[PDB]
């Protein structure tokens, strides 16, 4: 059982074809574990399409994805990535109509870049995009729980501020009650951190 | 966690509803024509009563007016009121000449 | 419309076929007029470009084609009796068919799709003629 | 306890949320027929924008018609009657559409949408001139009450003759293709107009003595001293007469006789269609051709199952055209 | 959600589709359906339809049933039918034989209003009118009887009961949301495994109401209101299916 | 088993009690209830009642809540109220501060029509009529708002939600079978715990419809059908209170 990312572009939404696509997706054995209708801004779209970053089609591609609300879906299936790649069919809409009819790109997609769907290529990009659009959707418990990778992540996170917080806790030595120490270290962390700034009125 | 009002086992109709049944039968009898009832002890039909000649007003019409105004009873009750007026004016034992629904 | 058959003395007798952009009729003819058990087969070409009522029809391969086992009917004396060169009713004429009857008493079934140029009369001698398929509807 | 204890780090999402709400244009348009729309104000000068007074159309008692129809048990519902009355007022009042008469023709079902038809009067064989015969009335069309008004084109004899040969379910797009083999010369709007012409010329009726012909203007007038018959007696076909001119097999109201040549006529220049006589205007429904068997064209409908009820309603329903209905209660009548 | 379909809801949502009943008959149904329901032991009894007649006394038909079992891989609802000319008094509609139904099928046109008529068929055969009416009603009932998919569910002792936790049919503008009552809840057979052009569906998304019309029998209508989660079906017209359907599509 | 009371079943079952609305207003309601429900982001919106004025232009009042949570032993519903002279267009009823909420209970007599009316009370205090209407609606809702017992349940996070498995109330004749809306499901508080003679229940055993009328507020009716579990309530008439209850009974 694997989870892939997918999104319905504004061309299949301005034509009111989103629900038909969702029903077709559910008919082929997929499961929509998470869905959200949203509207990307220019900066968010540019950050999402980082792999292209200045290619020939990038201007029109980023100008199109911010022309209306899209849908974002997380599909779940044993062969989700490959099966969804097949279900969408070939990227080029005219080549899709020629080769494989009765595919979502052939039916709903038109006019080249407006292929009416977007899917993930590999599990790396799938996980990256899922975390991009669903920050709180749990997943991938095997690629983060390696003792080497766990130690590496703890190393990346602790030197910035937690070591300093522990040093301050040891030097100040507040009430021996552990709850006060927990509160003090939490305040120190939420006050001193390299990622977020300090907020003042 | 079983919810409070899980299930109940009641008869189809409460055994203490004879009055409501009689009222329902009386109100249903207002509709259509009275079917002839054959007498007991034989097959001869019992002749119906000769109706009384009375006068009344248009009850569906003013039911429609009151429904358009949003007052009075429902349009499904004004029709039963018409039928009750007809039954009252049609009786021979109590001889009326004009009827009206107050 | 393409009309294919095995004709006898200037008239069609026996099994004949008639094809038009969306329709395909086939059955027995007597003296140029349909009679006996026939079969109609045609597609809902008018609603090919509207959303389907079921989602499984969107991705299916079979098209909206229906086939009916109908039966035409002729007056009992008219036709079916070669002329002698009468107590016989006349054959129905062109502008109105007076004695022609129709009958259908079974449900339609599922039929394979139809393309108008029937490939049996493929060389078309007529100047203007349309074509039809399920992928592309009435082209011209 | 677990439900109460789960961590939930609600963090600021990068995007502003968007609403998932169905489109509300149709329902807003439907609502827009209730109440009076107040005259908008001009921001530049607080005085109101220039306006036009309503129009003086001549419609029937549509609320009474809905009441009669619900009494007989036919037609549309009672609430849709109110909606139709308000929409017809919307159509008639419009100073842009100078309408001298509004009458709700009816409602054609369809596969994807329906058709609410409003009959409107304003203020090779050829075709009927605009305002003559079957082309006397225009026909506005809605898909839902209060929506946009689509005008139908005039009908031609070829369309009528072609429609007489096909039995097609309506799709409701108003632009769909009609038929392939019995080639219909037009789209679905033409087919709907032809169906309308046939049904209108076949099943629009009135009470017997209400109308009377007038040759000086060639028009029919209302009695204004007409005394309505008692209900349960309008359920008779002799109580109703036609109002619309007959539709000949040629495809029009008055046959077109091409002028015979000055010589070699021999009366054989005319086919069956050009030489045909039809019923006269204001003909009782009793003389309508009978159906197969000894069956009259119109079948009686009553408002009650007991003749004893003082005031009832009665009408007829059409056999050749299932759905065409005429009925009356008291002085209120409808078709 | 609903336990039984509501007559007033059915008449209110099918008013556009032309399925209407007279005022007297409406009130008489309101007052008389419960009486006939309680006279028998039927847990459910509702108006089934209104067939048109020639004299003017339309046949009102109602159907009822007590319990809904599953047997030989289908939901077998043991139903009982009643008819009437007025909404007040309800008479039984006797079931017919097999050959009598085959002969029933050959009578066309609207049957007359009088239930004492006899039709002559062919050795001659006499067919009562009530037999013809029951034949037509059972034909229509067998052909088209719509309920939203998974609105029912099995239980202990294997009886098809309502599903009180019904979430609502998803994508209700498509035929996969509705199913024949005879189809078992678990099975995936729905309103899409029959002929491709014998059902039409209209949908209002803002009000969330779906109307399903049968084209094989042009008098059968069904509504599903999603916001209230209430569904109901009615029949209005003579019990004739249009065999010339293909030329109509 | 229902999740929200219908506006058609309420008008049908309460028509006899005079709780009726004009047909044009009924169609306007049918169209413009979902419009306001979506324009205001409310999951539930139903017609609450209809108040009479010195004009024919009565106030139709509809209430709707988005969240409903347990708070200090009270089932607090975050209700919003809307008013309309005609069924088409709705306006809002802003809540009333306590000073004017106490200076509005002394103003009596049936309201006027224009909601821009200023009552003058005793130095002179100017109070808007909309404030008075809001006060009266709040008083009636506090005194009267009634639902069947066990029809609501408490989930995790302490939210009151409809009991999908509500099997109905046995003994619908008894007042114990009914409770106020703001009573917690666990607490055994009902209408029996109110004053002895302030609620009259008339139950038709045959049709299975119970009817509860408020005598302290004479214009409040609540019907409960048990054969199909459907309960609704409406207030029709002026919002004034019946002080001298002891003499009348």
Swiss-Prot record, chain B:
Quaternary structure and interacting proteins, as annotated: The radial spoke head is made of five different polypeptides (RSP1, RSP4, RSP6, RSP9, and RSP10).
Name recorded for this polypeptide: Flagellar radial spoke protein 6
Name of the gene this protein is made from: RSP6
Family named by the database record: Belongs to the flagellar radial spoke RSP4/6 family.
Cellular compartment(s): Cytoplasm, Cytoskeleton, Flagellum axoneme
PTM comment: Probably methylated by PRMT1.
Role, per record: Flagellar radial spokes contribute to the regulation of dynein arm activity and thus the pattern of flagellar bending. They consist of a thin stalk, which is attached to the a subfiber of the outer doublet microtubule, and a bulbous head, which is attached to the stalk and appears to interact with the projections from the central pair of microtubules.
From Swiss-Prot, chain C:
Top-rank lineage group of the source organism: Eukaryota
Residue segments, region Disordered: 73-95
The record's account of how the chain is modified after translation: Probably methylated by PRMT1.
Subcellular location: Cytoplasm, Cytoskeleton, Flagellum axoneme
Positions of MORN repeats: 5-19, 25-41
Role of this protein: Flagellar radial spokes contribute to the regulation of dynein arm activity and thus the pattern of flagellar bending. They consist of a thin stalk, which is attached to the a subfiber of the outer doublet microtubule, and a bulbous head, which is attached to the stalk and appears to interact with the projections from the central pair of microtubules.
Protein name: Flagellar radial spoke protein 1
Source organism (scientific name): Chlamydomonas reinhardtii (Chlamydomonas smithii)
Native organism taxonomy: Eukaryota, Viridiplantae, Chlorophyta, core chlorophytes, Chlorophyceae
Gene name as annotated: RSP1
Full protein: residues contained: 667 to 814 of 814
């Amino acid at each position: 059982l694997e989870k892939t990312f997918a999104l319905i572009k504004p061309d299949a939404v301005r034509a009111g074809k989103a629900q038909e696509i969702m029903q077709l997706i559910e008919l082929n054995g997929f499961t929509i574990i998470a869905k959200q209708k949203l509207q990307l801004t220019r900066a968010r779209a540019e950050e999402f399409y980082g792999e292209h970053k200045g290619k020939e089609f990038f201007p029109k591609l980023v100008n199109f994805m911010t022309s209306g609300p899209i849908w974002a879906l997380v599909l779940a299936k044993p062969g989700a990535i490959l099966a969804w790649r097949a279900l969408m069919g070939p990227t080029n809409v005219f080549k899709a109509r020629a080769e494989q009819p009765k595919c979502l790109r052939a039916l709903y997609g038109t006019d080249g870049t407006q292929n009416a769907t977007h899917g993930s290529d590999s599990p790396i990009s799938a996980a990256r995009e899922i975390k991009f659009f669903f920050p709180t959707l749990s997943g991938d418990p095997t690629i983060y729980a390696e003792p080497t990778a766990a130690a590496e992540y703890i190393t990346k996170r602790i030197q910035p501020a937690l070591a300093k917080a522990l040093a301050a806790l040891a030097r100040e030595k507040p009430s021996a009650d552990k709850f006060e120490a927990i509160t003090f270290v939490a305040g120190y962390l939420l006050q001193n951190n390299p990622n977020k700034p300090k907020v003042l009125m | 966690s079983t919810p409070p009002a899980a299930n109940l086992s009641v008869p189809l109709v409460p055994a203490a509803s004879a009055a409501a049944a009689a009222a329902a039968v009386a109100k249903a009898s207002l509709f259509g024509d009275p079917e002839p009832v054959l007498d007991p002890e034989s097959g001869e039909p019992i002749d119906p009563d000769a109706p009384n000649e009375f006068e009344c007003e248009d009850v569906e019409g003013d039911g429609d007016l009151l429904d358009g105004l949003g007052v009075g009873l429902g349009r499904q009750e004004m029709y039963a009121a018409m039928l009750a007026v007809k039954r009252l004016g049609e009786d021979a034992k109590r001889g009326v000449s004009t009827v009206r629904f107050f | 419309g393409c009309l294919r058959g095995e004709w006898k003395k200037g008239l069609l007798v026996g099994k004949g076929t008639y094809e038009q952009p969306a329709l395909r009729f086939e059955g027995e003819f007597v003296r140029g007029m349909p009679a006996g058990t026939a079969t109609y087969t045609l597609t809902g070409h008018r609603t090919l470009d509207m959303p389907c009522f079921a989602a499984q029809h969107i991705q299916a391969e079979e098209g909206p084609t229906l086939a009916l086992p109908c039966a035409y009917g002729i007056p009992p004396g008219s036709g079916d009796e070669p002329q002698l060169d009468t107590d016989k009713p006349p054959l129905p004429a062109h502008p109105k068919y007076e004695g022609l009857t129709f009958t259908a008493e079974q449900l339609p079934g599922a039929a394979p799709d139809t393309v108008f140029p029937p490939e049996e009369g493929k060389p078309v001698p007529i100047t203007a003629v349309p074509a039809f398929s399920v992928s592309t509807g009435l082209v011209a | 306890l677990v439900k109460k204890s789960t961590f939930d780090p609600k963090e600021s999402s990068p995007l502003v949320p968007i609403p998932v709400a169905p489109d509300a244009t149709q329902t807003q348009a439907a609502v827009s027929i209730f109440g009076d729309p107040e005259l908008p104000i001009n921001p530049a000068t607080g005085e109101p924008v220039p306006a036009d007074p309503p129009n003086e159309f001549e419609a029937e008692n549509m609320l009474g018609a809905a009441a009669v129809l619900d009494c007989l048990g036919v037609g549309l519902g009672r609430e849709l009657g109110v909606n139709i009355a308000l929409a017809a007022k919307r159509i008639g009042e419009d100073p842009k559409l100078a309408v001298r008469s509004v009458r709700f023709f009816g409602k054609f079902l369809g596969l994807y949408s329906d058709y609410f038809v409003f009959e409107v009067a304003f203020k090779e064989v050829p075709v009927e001139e605009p305002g003559k015969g079957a082309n006397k009335f225009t026909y506005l069309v809605c898909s839902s009450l209060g929506g946009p008004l689509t005008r139908l084109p005039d009908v031609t004899p070829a369309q009528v003759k072609a429609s007489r040969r096909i039995k097609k379910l309506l799709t409701g797009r108003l632009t769909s293709h009609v038929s392939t083999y019995p080639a219909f010369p037009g789209n679905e709007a033409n087919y709907l107009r032809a169906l309308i012409a046939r049904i209108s010329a076949a099943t629009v009726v009135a009470p017997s003595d209400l109308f009377s012909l007038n040759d000086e203007t060639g028009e029919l007038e209302r009695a204004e001293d007409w005394e309505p018959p008692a209900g349960r007696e309008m359920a008779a076909p002799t109580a109703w007469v036609h109002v619309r001119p007959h539709l000949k097999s040629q495809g029009r109201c008055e046959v077109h006789k091409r002028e015979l040549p000055e010589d070699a006529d021999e009366d054989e220049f005319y086919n069956e269609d050009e030489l045909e006589e039809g019923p006269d205007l204001l003909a009782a429904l009793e003389e309508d051709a009978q159906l197969p068997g000894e069956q009259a064209a119109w079948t009686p409908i009553y408002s009650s199952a007991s003749e004893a009820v003082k005031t009832q309603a009665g009408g007829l329903r059409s056999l050749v055209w299932p759905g065409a209905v005429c009925g009356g209660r008291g002085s209120e009548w409808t078709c | 959600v609903q336990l039984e379909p509501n007559i007033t809801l059915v008449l209110k949502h099918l008013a556009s589709c032309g399925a209407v009943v007279s005022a007297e008959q409406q009130a008489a149904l309101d007052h008389s359906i419960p009486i006939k329901r309680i006279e028998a032991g039927l847990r459910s009894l509702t108006l089934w339809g209104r067939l048109t007649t020639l004299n003017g006394k339309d046949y009102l038909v109602a159907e009822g049933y007590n319990v809904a079992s599953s047997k030989e891989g289908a939901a077998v609802y043991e139903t009982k039918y009643f008819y009437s000319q007025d909404g007040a008094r309800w008479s039984d509609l006797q079931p017919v034989d097999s050959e009598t139904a085959t002969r029933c099928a050959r009578i066309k046109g609207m049957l007359s209003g009088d239930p004492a008529k006899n039709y002559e068929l062919e050795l001659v055969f006499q067919i009562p009118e009530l037999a013809v009416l029951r034949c037509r009603v059972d034909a229509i009932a067998t052909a088209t009887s719509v309920i939203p998919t998974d609105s029912t569910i099995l239980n202990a002792a294997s009886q098809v009961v309502p599903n009180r936790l019904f979430a609502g049919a998803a994508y209700p503008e498509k035929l996969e949301s509705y199913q024949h009552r005879f189809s078992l809840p678990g099975s995936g057979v729905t309103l899409s495994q029959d002929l491709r052009g014998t059902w039409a569906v209209q949908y209002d998304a803002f009000k969330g109401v779906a109307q399903v019309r049968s084209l094989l029998f042009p008098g059968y209508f069904f509504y599903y209101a999603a916001n209230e989660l209430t569904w109901g079906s009615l029949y209005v017209g003579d019990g004739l299916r249009n065999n010339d359907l293909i030329f109509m599509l």
